[PDB]
Structures are given as structure tokens and as C-alpha cells.
Amino acid sequence: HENSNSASEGSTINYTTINYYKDAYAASAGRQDMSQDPKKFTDPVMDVIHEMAPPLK
């Protein structure tokens, strides 16, 4: 196969990349993932807050 040496190998992007050489960083970018996690930036709070209840009672 190819000696896999890229920047994104642990958690990677989609499997449509094209390559003709033996090193994996020569490959194209391809199309990207649609994965996202918002709640570790918009809700970094220990005790969970519900939208219905008062948050400070």
C-alpha cells in the first residue's frame, strides 16, 4: 500500500482522496466531513441547564 504519513490520520476526513505516489501527504484534499460538536463551546457547564426551567433557582 502506501506508508501513511499525513496531517490527519487519527481522526480523519472522507475516503475519496486520490493519490498516484507512494507518500500519503502527496494526496488531494477530497471532500470533507459534516461532523460538528457545538456544546463544548456554547455549553461548557457542569450542571445541566434545561431550557424550560429557570437557570438560577
Partner: protein, 283 residues
């Protein structure tokens, strides 16, 4: 177990979202105790009130894709990083690799703190008025620690180990691929501290903010022949960014840059972030 003392959580996991979230229908509501319109911004969490909890909405199925907002599509565009001219007068230049010389790419990369990527470099070369003359050129990448060429015909130009390209002016522009080559796990654009030990004084005060995990050596071009070429040369270097992973976002800079190595700004004209108006009641 003679000693009873010695024997002795992630918050949210990611998921894929191909399209923007839909809008579900709702009606009016009259009740006590339950209130989504009142929040508390003091806890540092953003509000979670949607559209349907404040007004009545219909049902809307939207298919708006979020593809253009990914970090891969945001960064994979070639931008100018260097202008290198050979009027220097001896037919060769040694340019230290520093990618913070032009403000349009510096502002995008300083949006994140840590970054990890592979590049792709492209060299577009012509005369200082766009004119074309048939001419042979040589590029050579010098890693840190390697000897550097001091003349147009030095022994460093034999390139027994160094990667090098030979290309003409009339040709299509050259392209290469560069892997991730830092000693650390990711590049960083900010380094709060001094690189060395020992006493810090006013003679060594310029060391503040220089991380050696980003210094990648130098870059050298020359005309191939042993004599003096009669033409002026000008090189432009463009860099793309592939396989991007980023960490820890930051506020964006709103002051104009002054140097390539430090975030110093002009202290007299502090630019206000927004364009000012006359009155608060009249737009």
C-alpha cells in the same frame, strides 16, 4: 490490602450534521413557572431559546448545506507569502522561511492557536515588468543546521542530499508538496515565554515570543550559470494548506500589523472596532 487508602467524564460527543436543522411547528402557550425567554448570561453558557419558544412558527424543511464552513474548504486556497527579487546583486538570495510577511494570510491563520497541516508550494517567476526571457533557474531548500551557499558557484549547490528543483522561465510554474515537519505535535502562532534559560535582560528582550518549533531553515535560489546574468528576476511564492486540524480559537486582530515577529501595534491611533455614528437613537 494492608492500606485501605492506596487501592482507591466527557461532556458531549460529536455527531454529523449534513444540513441545517429544520423548524417544527408550534402554537401559543399560557402557563406559569415554565419560562424559556428568561436566561442568565452570568454562567458563561449561551442561551438555548429557539424560534418556537418565543413566537408561533410553521414547519420549514430546509436543505441548506454546511459544507463551505468546514475548516478544510476555508483554508485550501493559495495565498501570497513572499516577493523575492534578484536585482542579491550577485545572482543569489538566501531568504529565511517566515510566513507572516503579508497580512491577508496572517489574519486567517491567527484565528486559531494550534494548527497542524501539510502545505503545497507554487513558484511564479518573471521579470519585474511581467516580461519573459528564456533563463534557467535553480531552487534549493536548506534545513536548519545545513551549510548555506555564500556565492553563486559554491559547493553547496551540488545538492547531494538537499531537495531541489530545476525549472525554466518559459515553463509552467513549479509545484511541490511539503509534509508536517515540526518537532512538536502542532505549529503554534503564539508562544508566551522565553526559549532559553538563564537571566533575561534588556539585551535579550527580543527573545520573547520566538519558538524554535516554527523556524524551518532557509530557502535559496540562483541563476544556474557561473557568470552574471543580465536580467532582473522576481519570484512570487504561493502556499496552499491541506489536511487541516485546528485547536483553541481566538479573537481576531482589529489593529494593523507592524512587524513579522511580535504583535506590536501603533499606540497613537487606536482604531475603534466599529464605524462610529452620530446619535444612539437615529441609525
Amino acid at each position: 490490602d494492608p492500606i485501605a487508602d492506596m487501592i482507591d467524564r466527557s461532556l458531549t460527543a460529536l455527531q454529523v450534521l449534513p444540513t441545517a436543522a429544520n423548524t417544527e411547528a408550534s402554537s401559543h402557550r399560557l402557563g406559569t413557572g415554565v419560562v424559556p425567554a428568561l436566561q442568565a448570561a452570568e454562567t458563561g453558557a449561551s442561551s438555548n431559546a429557539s424560534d418556537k419558544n418565543l413566537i408561533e412558527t410553521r414547519c420549514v424543511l430546509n436543505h441548506h448545506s454546511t459544507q463551505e464552513t468546514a475548516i478544510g474548504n476555508f483554508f485550501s486556497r493559495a495565498g501570497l507569502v513572499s516577493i523575492i527579487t534578484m536585482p542579491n546583486t550577485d545572482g543569489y538570495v538566501n531568504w529565511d522561511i517566515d510566513l507572516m510577511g503579508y497580512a491577508q494570510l496572517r489574519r486567517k491563520c491567527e484565528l486559531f492557536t494550534y494548527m497542524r497541516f501539510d502545505a503545497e508550494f507554487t513558484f511564479v517567476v518573471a521579470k519585474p515588468n511581467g516580461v519573459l526571457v528564456p533563463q534557467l533557474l535553480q531552487y534549493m531548500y536548506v534545513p536548519p543546521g545545513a551549510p548555506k551557499p555564500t556565492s553563486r558557484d559554491s559547493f553547496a549547490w551540488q545538492t547531494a542530499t538537499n531537495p531541489s528543483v530545476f525549472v525554466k522561465m518559459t515553463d509552467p510554474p513549479a509545484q511541490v508538496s511539503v509534509p508536517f515537519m515540526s518537532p512538536a505535535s502542532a505549529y503554534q502562532w503564539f508562544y508566551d515565554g522565553y526559549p532559553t534559560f538563564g537571566e533575561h535582560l534588556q539585551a535579550n528582550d527580543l527573545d520573547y515570543g520566538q519558538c524554535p518549533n516554527n523556524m524551518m531553515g532557509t530557502f535559496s535560489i540562483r541563476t544556474v550559470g557561473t557568470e552574471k546574468s543580465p536580467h532582473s528576476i522576481t519570484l512570487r511564492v504561493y502556499m496552499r494548506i491541506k489536511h487541516v486540524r485546528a485547536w483553541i480559537p481566538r479573537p481576531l486582530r482589529n489593529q494593523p500589523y507592524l512587524f513579522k515577529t511580535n504583535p506590536n501595534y501603533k499606540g497613537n491611533d487606536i482604531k475603534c472596532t466599529s464605524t462610529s455614528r452620530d446619535k444612539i437613537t437615529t441609525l
